[PDB]
């Protein structure tokens, strides 16, 4: 839909503070903060696939809207995730260990804007079509 495509990271705010909230260690934050991932989003039937490629780590999730699924995150957290479409915005919650983080993916102008929230910290990442 508006989300399908290959999307390259062009800007990032507060990603270090977000990773710290996730409990990511210094050495790994350093590497994570300077990688420039590509995100490839596809849809076939009920199933949406989000594949992220970077020099540090790759990840891929496949999901149906509204259906909880198990996911291993790029920092190797084992989480329960649920993604829904809410007024044009893909809203994901990840839950693990009594904790949770929310990730909103939205389409704005020519951008894919991703806002991640954990506790008081809000990180905003912007991707553009590659
Ligand atoms: C497939 O990994 C891509 C990288 C990534 N790594 C991490 C951890 C692993 C290293 C420490 C943090 C996270 C949490 C995310 C992320 C960001 C926003 C999110 F909303 C969700 C995950 C992403 C990411 N994914 N897509 N863009 N950046 C991008 C840069 C280094 C690896």
Swiss-Prot record:
Positions with a binding annotation for a fatty acid: 125-127
Subcellular location: Cytoplasm; Nucleus
Function: Lipid transport protein in adipocytes. Binds both long chain fatty acids and retinoic acid. Delivers long-chain fatty acids and retinoic acid to their cognate receptors in the nucleus.
InterPro entries: Calycin, Fatty_acid-bd, ILBP, Lipocln_cytosolic_FA-bd_dom
Gene coding for it: FABP4
Organism, as annotated: Homo sapiens (Human)
Self-association state and partner proteins as the record states: Monomer. Homodimer. Interacts with PPARG.
Family statement: Belongs to the calycin superfamily. Fatty-acid binding protein (FABP) family.
The name this protein goes by in its record: Fatty acid-binding protein, adipocyte
């Amino acid at each position: 839909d508006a989300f399908v495509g290959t999307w390259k990271l062009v800007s990032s705010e507060n990603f270090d503070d977000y990773m710290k909230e996730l409990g990511v260690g210094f050495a790994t934050r350093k590497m994570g903060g300077m990688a420039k991932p590509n995100c490839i989003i596809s849809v076939n039937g009920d199933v949406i696939t989000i594949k992220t490629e970077s020099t540090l780590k790759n990840t891929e999730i496949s999901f149906i809207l509204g259906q909880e699924f198990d996911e291993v995150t790029a920092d190797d957290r084992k989480v329960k995730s649920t993604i829904t479409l809410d007024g044009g915005v893909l809203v994901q919650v990840q839950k693990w260990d009594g904790k949770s983080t929310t990730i909103k993916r939205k389409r704005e102008d020519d951008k894919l804007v991703v806002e991640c929230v954990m506790k008081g910290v809000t990180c905003t990442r912007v991707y553009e079509r590659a």
